[PDB]
Amino acid sequence: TKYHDLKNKVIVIAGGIKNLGALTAKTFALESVNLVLHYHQAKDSDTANKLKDELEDQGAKVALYQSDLSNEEEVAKLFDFAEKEFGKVDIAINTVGKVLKKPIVETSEAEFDAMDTINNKVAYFFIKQAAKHMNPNGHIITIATSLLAAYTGFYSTAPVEHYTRAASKELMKQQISVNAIAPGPMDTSFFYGQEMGNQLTKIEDIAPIIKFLTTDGWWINGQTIFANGGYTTR
Amino acid sequence: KYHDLKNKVIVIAGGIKNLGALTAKTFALESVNLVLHYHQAKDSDTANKLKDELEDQGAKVALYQSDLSNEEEVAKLFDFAEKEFGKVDIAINTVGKVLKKPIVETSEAEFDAMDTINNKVAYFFIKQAAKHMNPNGHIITIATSLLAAYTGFYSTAPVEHYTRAASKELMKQQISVNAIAPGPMDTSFNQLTKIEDIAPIIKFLTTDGWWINGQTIFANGGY
């Protein structure tokens, strides 16, 4: 019931072409794995195809899928696309919602909170749609970040924690793992979607937790892992 | 950010049977220096057997028998470890004082008093590991409750509190302090948590999970 081998496996990553998502894909592509990589913005197609090209040279298969990924319909169609090309999904990873198009200085507390409500809704739909297209012994992982909590500095050590726990209970019979990782304060660049000492969480510290949870950490279920180095504020 | 697990000094309390033995075997894949505590003198031939098989993996092993029931004895374990190997890199507390009397002959008050001594020793373990530790060290405690095992009511607790406060305190010394709370295991220590699913989490936290700090990880299969 534990994965002896992670090859021939089907993996969906929402936001899988840059930042945490791309690093997560490279970590999985050490074995002969089937990656469907989602990306939000159509202009990032050359970054996606560059990554596709190097991951194919890692010995992995790569299907790309662009979408705004903002409603249940668009989320459903991501997993439809996944099933169409590789068959039923084994591992689904939600790494990022939509990023900031405005400077943080020019954004208010209400419009940050509204961005959270949208991202929470999409993450709920991601979990729901993953499971309906998923093999038994499968894994769902949401990367829990709050734009409002990052702006005000109030990090906890929460909707996605509630969706994670409730969905793990409901998918117990289907034998699907549902977990979340909540990183500590990160660099401003990631929330624009770009990339003194550092008390900041790096993506290099989050990616191997994702790989672990789907492999040797398979018994962790219903959990939100806070990975922040002990730093709760910035 | 560990480069290797090579040359590292690892202390395991309750290290010769069950989870501790498995933890020891997992770490001994690389060339480690292991200090394996065991509670009972009658388990010495089991200890020497495990020492033999871990030496045949490439690891150096020192055994240490102790009741481990107060701060003085916990201080002595780490003094021993520092004497034999130098400063500790990784300290694991797996165990807790086990049952002599059967479960049926044991009252709730006796289980509660066993948990209290275990909680106190867990506090002392973290405190005394920290005093003998290199920078970038790791302290891990396996959080179980004999009362919760007896009653069947599991939470998803003193050790969580100890873990949190110690990690805040040791922030400048660069020591991570973490706990793992497994679900219902077997009565000798399917919906049960196996030890084979717990020892990889111990190994991961010391390596690629190094950024996890101050946390209690609940590993119960969702049950």
TrEMBL record, chain A:
UniProt keyword list: Oxidoreductase
* GO molecular-function terms, A-Z: oxidoreductase activity, acting on CH-OH group of donors
The protein's matches in InterPro entries, at most eight in alphabetical order, are given as:
NAD(P)-bd_dom_sf, SDR_fam
In terms of superkingdom, the source organism counts as Bacteria
PANTHER family xrefs: NADPH-DEPENDENT ALDEHYDE REDUCTASE-LIKE PROTEIN, CHLOROPLASTIC-RELATED (PTHR48107), RE15974P (PTHR48107:SF7)
The record's family statement is: Belongs to the short-chain dehydrogenases/reductases (SDR) family.
Q: What is this protein called?
A: 3-oxoacyl-acyl carrier protein reductase
Q: Which organism is it from?
A: Oenococcus oeni (strain ATCC BAA-331 / PSU-1)
